[PDB]
Amino acid sequence: GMSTAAESEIRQLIERWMQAVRDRDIPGIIAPYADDIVAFDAIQALQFKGKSAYTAHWEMCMGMCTGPMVFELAQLTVHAAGDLALAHWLNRCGPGDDESQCGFMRATVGYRRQGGQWQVIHEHWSAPFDMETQKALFDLKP
Amino acid sequence: GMSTAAESEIRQLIERWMQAVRDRDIPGIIAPYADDIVAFDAIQALQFKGKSAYTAHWEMCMGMCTGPMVFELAQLTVHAAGDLALAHWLNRCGPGDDESQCGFMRATVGYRRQGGQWQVIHEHWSAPFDMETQKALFDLKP
């Protein structure tokens, strides 16, 4: 079954990674990423393939938001067995200056134990949209 | 490391499940779902929790699209180790009558081996959106 030691390690990886995002610390954001990470981000493109391309995307995103930021999580679920792990959570984000602009997105992350370390091999970030308006829904409750 | 036998089983589960969706076969859609499945769907709500609630959502979605359908996949990646598995793929969908309405979404699925069977414990479906327009982007290439 599941490994509580691995799940504890994944939870700590997530804590430091979230903190890196809030600190705008790019080296900390990408440190746990596998070289062949595949990421589905919430915006702009269908996917990013490989750490170099996804780094370039993070660098662009980072430079393009001045001011304070909300980046916090709710309903974290973590499962880990052997060399594979999965986590998912709801992620509140937006401008720390204005909470009228701060909503929930969804997150899923896949991890693999390699070189004696857990690395992120996959991320999927998104907002749901409305069928009729085809607009992203940002004001929804968990 | 990874189990090729488990990954072969997960690939077959995915093949039959996709077919169930195209056949509008609700019993086949939900058959592999764990009772406590957590799903982030592409539309309408942040999340659905539990098989009963997610079944109700599938039933509503299903009844509300007449006509033929595209539901096919590209770039399937599957990893499995012990009692946990992860898959992700790009999913082309839309009206089979009109290909002007047929685009790519992203899919991530988490699986767990329990009761001697693989069950789906998590799904995340989405489209990316545009920052400026906040509209879902449906015409993007893989």
Q: How many DSSP E strands of chain A?
A: 6
- Structural class by SSE content of chain A: alpha+beta
Oligomer: homodimer
Report the sheet-strand fraction of chain A.
35-45%
Shape of chain A: globular
Query: What is the topology, as strand order, of the major beta sheet of chain A?
Result: 2-1-6-5-4-3
Whole-number total of structural domains of chain A:
1
- The CATH topology of chain A corresponds to Nuclear Transport Factor 2, Chain: A
Individual helix count of chain A: 3
- End-to-end gap of chain A: 29 Å
CATH class of chain A: Alpha Beta
Percentage of residues assigned to helices of chain A: 25-40%
CATH architecture of chain A: Roll
Largest interface chains and counts: A-B, 44 and 44 residues
What's the story with the biggest beta sheet of chain A?
6 strands, mixed
What is the CA-atom radius of gyration of chain A, in angstroms? Answer: 15 Å
* H/E topology pattern of chain A: HHEEHEEEE
Protein name (chains A, B): SnoaL-like domain-containing protein
Domain SnoaL-like (chains A, B): 10-129
PDB class: unknown function
Keywords: NTF2-like protein, jcsg, protein structure initiative, unknown function
Q: Quick gist of this model?
A:
2 copies of one chain form a homodimer. Chain A is α+β, with helices and mostly antiparallel strands. Chain A has 3 helices and 6 strands, in the order H-H-E-E-H-E-E-E-E.
